Amino acid sequence: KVFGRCELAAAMKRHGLDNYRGYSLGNWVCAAKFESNFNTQATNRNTDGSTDYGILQINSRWWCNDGRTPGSRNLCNIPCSALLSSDITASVNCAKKIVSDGNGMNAWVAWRNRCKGTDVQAWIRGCRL
Ligand code: NA
Ligand SMILES: [V+3]
């Protein structure tokens, strides 16, 4: 599913991400835009052989099992394919674990390089949430 910006903002707010660990909703929307273009089906292979999955590009090196990332962890205790659903529940619940681990949203390279320190409130402008 390719979300609209405000449709994703509303889904993320309903699933508890607005100000989760102090990250405003606009941070999460911005991260999803630059990680996946708001596409729940997005997949991208990493240089180490891991893959990133779904709307928040969650990495098989630590967070999920994709059957092809040797010596990796499954800290969200899910198959990576669960992260590709039109329902963002599994991606949100796993992202709450990630952002809580000590590194905050710096885990998301696109957030660090494209969202951090910008006016992220712009991402939710005009949305009936
Ligand atoms: Na894994
Ligand atoms: V890696």
Swiss-Prot record:
Domain C-type lysozyme: 1-129
Entry's Gene Ontology cellular component terms: cytoplasm; endoplasmic reticulum; extracellular space
InterPro entries recorded: Glyco_hydro_22 (IPR001916), Glyco_hydro_22_CS (IPR019799), Glyco_hydro_22_lys (IPR000974), Lysozyme-like_dom_sf (IPR023346)
GO molecular function, one term: lysozyme activity
Pfam families xref list: Lys
Tissue specificity remark: In the egg white and polymorphonuclear leukocytes.
Superkingdom of source: Eukaryota
Other information: Lysozyme C is capable of both hydrolysis and transglycosylation; it also shows a slight esterase activity. It acts rapidly on both peptide-substituted and unsubstituted peptidoglycan, and slowly on chitin oligosaccharides.
Record's subunit section: Monomer.
Protein name in the entry: Lysozyme C
Organism: Gallus gallus
Name of the encoding gene: LYZ
